[PDB]
mmCIF file of N, CA and C and ligand atoms in Angstrom:
data_model
loop_
_atom_site.group_PDB
_atom_site.id
_atom_site.type_symbol
_atom_site.label_atom_id
_atom_site.label_comp_id
_atom_site.label_asym_id
_atom_site.label_seq_id
_atom_site.Cartn_x
_atom_site.Cartn_y
_atom_site.Cartn_z
ATOM 1 N N UNK E 1 -12.503 -64.269 -101.204
ATOM 2 C CA UNK E 1 -13.895 -64.244 -100.724
ATOM 3 C C UNK E 1 -14.641 -63.133 -101.448
ATOM 4 N N UNK E 2 -15.961 -63.281 -101.517
ATOM 5 C CA UNK E 2 -16.819 -62.289 -102.199
ATOM 6 C C UNK E 2 -17.316 -61.261 -101.184
ATOM 7 N N UNK E 3 -17.142 -60.003 -101.518
ATOM 8 C CA UNK E 3 -17.651 -58.882 -100.762
ATOM 9 C C UNK E 3 -18.562 -58.037 -101.628
ATOM 10 N N UNK E 4 -19.474 -57.322 -100.984
ATOM 11 C CA UNK E 4 -20.467 -56.518 -101.646
ATOM 12 C C UNK E 4 -20.317 -55.045 -101.294
ATOM 13 N N UNK E 5 -20.608 -54.164 -102.246
ATOM 14 C CA UNK E 5 -20.707 -52.744 -102.044
ATOM 15 C C UNK E 5 -22.080 -52.254 -102.493
ATOM 16 N N UNK E 6 -22.771 -51.528 -101.621
ATOM 17 C CA UNK E 6 -23.940 -50.749 -101.974
ATOM 18 C C UNK E 6 -23.515 -49.286 -102.066
ATOM 19 N N UNK E 7 -23.609 -48.714 -103.282
ATOM 20 C CA UNK E 7 -23.209 -47.386 -103.506
ATOM 21 C C UNK E 7 -24.482 -46.552 -103.637
ATOM 22 N N UNK E 8 -24.712 -45.638 -102.698
ATOM 23 C CA UNK E 8 -25.907 -44.814 -102.658
ATOM 24 C C UNK E 8 -25.508 -43.346 -102.821
ATOM 25 N N UNK E 9 -25.198 -42.981 -104.053
ATOM 26 C CA UNK E 9 -24.967 -41.600 -104.377
ATOM 27 C C UNK E 9 -26.264 -40.896 -104.728
ATOM 28 N N UNK E 10 -26.181 -39.577 -104.803
ATOM 29 C CA UNK E 10 -27.339 -38.748 -105.140
ATOM 30 C C UNK E 10 -27.894 -39.121 -106.535
ATOM 31 N N UNK E 11 -27.009 -39.207 -107.536
ATOM 32 C CA UNK E 11 -27.399 -39.524 -108.893
ATOM 33 C C UNK E 11 -26.722 -40.784 -109.459
ATOM 34 N N UNK E 12 -25.823 -41.402 -108.693
ATOM 35 C CA UNK E 12 -25.138 -42.621 -109.057
ATOM 36 C C UNK E 12 -25.449 -43.648 -108.001
ATOM 37 N N UNK E 13 -25.919 -44.816 -108.396
ATOM 38 C CA UNK E 13 -26.347 -45.825 -107.505
ATOM 39 C C UNK E 13 -25.894 -47.163 -108.006
ATOM 40 N N UNK E 14 -25.506 -48.059 -107.130
ATOM 41 C CA UNK E 14 -25.094 -49.347 -107.602
ATOM 42 C C UNK E 14 -24.983 -50.410 -106.519
ATOM 43 N N UNK E 15 -24.939 -51.658 -106.977
ATOM 44 C CA UNK E 15 -24.581 -52.803 -106.156
ATOM 45 C C UNK E 15 -23.499 -53.565 -106.907
ATOM 46 N N UNK E 16 -22.392 -53.835 -106.212
ATOM 47 C CA UNK E 16 -21.278 -54.488 -106.820
ATOM 48 C C UNK E 16 -20.845 -55.670 -105.952
ATOM 49 N N UNK E 17 -20.249 -56.690 -106.531
ATOM 50 C CA UNK E 17 -19.500 -57.659 -105.822
ATOM 51 C C UNK E 17 -18.083 -57.727 -106.346
ATOM 52 N N UNK E 18 -17.148 -57.981 -105.440
ATOM 53 C CA UNK E 18 -15.774 -58.107 -105.806
ATOM 54 C C UNK E 18 -15.213 -59.323 -105.108
ATOM 55 N N UNK E 19 -14.326 -60.030 -105.775
ATOM 56 C CA UNK E 19 -13.510 -61.022 -105.137
ATOM 57 C C UNK E 19 -12.266 -60.336 -104.563
ATOM 58 N N UNK E 20 -11.998 -60.574 -103.270
ATOM 59 C CA UNK E 20 -10.879 -59.900 -102.600
ATOM 60 C C UNK E 20 -10.281 -60.864 -101.590
ATOM 61 N N UNK E 21 -9.020 -60.620 -101.238
ATOM 62 C CA UNK E 21 -8.322 -61.562 -100.330
ATOM 63 C C UNK E 21 -8.949 -61.534 -98.901
ATOM 64 N N UNK E 22 -9.441 -60.365 -98.494
ATOM 65 C CA UNK E 22 -9.877 -60.088 -97.135
ATOM 66 C C UNK E 22 -10.602 -58.752 -97.121
ATOM 67 N N UNK E 23 -11.147 -58.401 -95.954
ATOM 68 C CA UNK E 23 -11.965 -57.185 -95.895
ATOM 69 C C UNK E 23 -11.129 -55.912 -96.159
ATOM 70 N N UNK E 24 -9.860 -55.895 -95.732
ATOM 71 C CA UNK E 24 -9.024 -54.714 -95.961
ATOM 72 C C UNK E 24 -8.886 -54.500 -97.500
ATOM 73 N N UNK E 25 -8.731 -55.607 -98.246
ATOM 74 C CA UNK E 25 -8.587 -55.489 -99.707
ATOM 75 C C UNK E 25 -9.937 -55.081 -100.340
ATOM 76 N N UNK E 26 -11.039 -55.614 -99.857
ATOM 77 C CA UNK E 26 -12.346 -55.215 -100.378
ATOM 78 C C UNK E 26 -12.556 -53.717 -100.127
ATOM 79 N N UNK E 27 -12.210 -53.264 -98.902
ATOM 80 C CA UNK E 27 -12.387 -51.867 -98.568
ATOM 81 C C UNK E 27 -11.576 -50.989 -99.546
ATOM 82 N N UNK E 28 -10.345 -51.397 -99.780
ATOM 83 C CA UNK E 28 -9.450 -50.641 -100.662
ATOM 84 C C UNK E 28 -10.063 -50.527 -102.060
ATOM 85 N N UNK E 29 -10.534 -51.675 -102.583
ATOM 86 C CA UNK E 29 -11.119 -51.680 -103.924
ATOM 87 C C UNK E 29 -12.341 -50.770 -103.964
ATOM 88 N N UNK E 30 -13.219 -50.939 -102.972
ATOM 89 C CA UNK E 30 -14.483 -50.188 -103.008
ATOM 90 C C UNK E 30 -14.314 -48.714 -102.765
ATOM 91 N N UNK E 31 -13.402 -48.337 -101.859
ATOM 92 C CA UNK E 31 -13.144 -46.938 -101.681
ATOM 93 C C UNK E 31 -12.577 -46.316 -102.967
ATOM 94 N N UNK E 32 -11.684 -47.019 -103.651
ATOM 95 C CA UNK E 32 -11.149 -46.489 -104.900
ATOM 96 C C UNK E 32 -12.240 -46.382 -105.969
ATOM 97 N N UNK E 33 -13.165 -47.332 -105.991
ATOM 98 C CA UNK E 33 -14.295 -47.307 -106.992
ATOM 99 C C UNK E 33 -15.160 -46.074 -106.748
ATOM 100 N N UNK E 34 -15.517 -45.845 -105.470
ATOM 101 C CA UNK E 34 -16.371 -44.740 -105.158
ATOM 102 C C UNK E 34 -15.648 -43.412 -105.436
ATOM 103 N N UNK E 35 -14.379 -43.313 -105.044
ATOM 104 C CA UNK E 35 -13.634 -42.087 -105.237
ATOM 105 C C UNK E 35 -13.539 -41.754 -106.738
ATOM 106 N N UNK E 36 -13.303 -42.761 -107.594
ATOM 107 C CA UNK E 36 -13.174 -42.481 -109.037
ATOM 108 C C UNK E 36 -14.504 -41.961 -109.610
ATOM 109 N N UNK E 37 -15.617 -42.351 -108.988
ATOM 110 C CA UNK E 37 -16.949 -41.887 -109.420
ATOM 111 C C UNK E 37 -17.363 -40.580 -108.725
ATOM 112 N N UNK E 38 -16.506 -40.035 -107.857
ATOM 113 C CA UNK E 38 -16.811 -38.788 -107.161
ATOM 114 C C UNK E 38 -17.844 -38.947 -106.051
ATOM 115 N N UNK E 39 -17.995 -40.165 -105.491
ATOM 116 C CA UNK E 39 -18.969 -40.454 -104.489
ATOM 117 C C UNK E 39 -18.240 -40.609 -103.158
ATOM 118 N N UNK E 40 -18.585 -39.730 -102.230
ATOM 119 C CA UNK E 40 -18.126 -39.915 -100.866
ATOM 120 C C UNK E 40 -19.258 -39.579 -99.917
ATOM 121 N N UNK E 41 -19.090 -40.094 -98.706
ATOM 122 C CA UNK E 41 -20.124 -39.994 -97.725
ATOM 123 C C UNK E 41 -19.819 -40.837 -96.510
ATOM 124 N N UNK E 42 -20.880 -41.248 -95.842
ATOM 125 C CA UNK E 42 -20.779 -42.131 -94.718
ATOM 126 C C UNK E 42 -20.528 -43.550 -95.231
ATOM 127 N N UNK E 43 -19.520 -44.203 -94.659
ATOM 128 C CA UNK E 43 -19.166 -45.587 -95.001
ATOM 129 C C UNK E 43 -19.627 -46.537 -93.914
ATOM 130 N N UNK E 44 -20.054 -47.732 -94.286
ATOM 131 C CA UNK E 44 -20.392 -48.785 -93.366
ATOM 132 C C UNK E 44 -19.739 -50.088 -93.765
ATOM 133 N N UNK E 45 -19.508 -50.977 -92.795
ATOM 134 C CA UNK E 45 -19.063 -52.335 -93.066
ATOM 135 C C UNK E 45 -19.739 -53.269 -92.081
ATOM 136 N N UNK E 46 -20.313 -54.348 -92.580
ATOM 137 C CA UNK E 46 -20.952 -55.381 -91.818
ATOM 138 C C UNK E 46 -20.262 -56.705 -92.105
ATOM 139 N N UNK E 47 -19.474 -57.192 -91.152
ATOM 140 C CA UNK E 47 -18.674 -58.391 -91.410
ATOM 141 C C UNK E 47 -19.545 -59.628 -91.606
ATOM 142 N N UNK E 48 -20.670 -59.740 -90.891
ATOM 143 C CA UNK E 48 -21.468 -60.936 -90.998
ATOM 144 C C UNK E 48 -22.019 -61.103 -92.429
ATOM 145 N N UNK E 49 -22.233 -59.976 -93.147
ATOM 146 C CA UNK E 49 -22.792 -60.047 -94.473
ATOM 147 C C UNK E 49 -21.758 -59.664 -95.545
ATOM 148 N N UNK E 50 -20.505 -59.432 -95.149
ATOM 149 C CA UNK E 50 -19.393 -59.037 -96.023
ATOM 150 C C UNK E 50 -19.822 -57.863 -96.915
ATOM 151 N N UNK E 51 -20.580 -56.917 -96.354
ATOM 152 C CA UNK E 51 -21.163 -55.814 -97.102
ATOM 153 C C UNK E 51 -20.686 -54.439 -96.619
ATOM 154 N N UNK E 52 -20.194 -53.647 -97.578
ATOM 155 C CA UNK E 52 -19.861 -52.254 -97.430
ATOM 156 C C UNK E 52 -20.969 -51.392 -98.007
ATOM 157 N N UNK E 53 -21.212 -50.216 -97.433
ATOM 158 C CA UNK E 53 -22.067 -49.221 -98.068
ATOM 159 C C UNK E 53 -21.396 -47.873 -97.993
ATOM 160 N N UNK E 54 -21.732 -47.033 -98.984
ATOM 161 C CA UNK E 54 -21.368 -45.644 -98.967
ATOM 162 C C UNK E 54 -22.618 -44.823 -99.328
ATOM 163 N N UNK E 55 -22.921 -43.806 -98.554
ATOM 164 C CA UNK E 55 -24.139 -43.027 -98.758
ATOM 165 C C UNK E 55 -23.788 -41.545 -98.767
ATOM 166 N N UNK E 56 -24.134 -40.860 -99.858
ATOM 167 C CA UNK E 56 -23.879 -39.456 -100.005
ATOM 168 C C UNK E 56 -25.006 -38.662 -99.322
HETATM 169 CL CL1 CL K 101 -2.925 -53.949 -102.095
HETATM 170 NA NA1 NA K 102 -23.171 -37.411 -105.696
HETATM 171 NA NA1 NA K 103 -9.497 -49.374 -93.407
HETATM 172 ZN ZN1 ZN K 104 -2.715 -56.037 -101.286
#
C-alpha cells in the first residue's frame, strides 16, 4: 500500500510516498529517512489518509 510522509524541518522540507507492506513498515521507513536527514520532532499518523508527518 502507498503511504505518505510530510517532512517539515526547519530548513529541510518534503513530501514523499513509499510503497510499504503496512503502517508499521511505512513508519520504519519514514523514521529512518528523517533520522538520516537529521530531522526529528513531533510525529503524527493518520490512518484514514495513510499519512505520517514529522515537524521540527
Ligand atoms: Cl523490516
Ligand atoms: Na532541522
Ligand atoms: Na511504531
Ligand atoms: Zn519487515
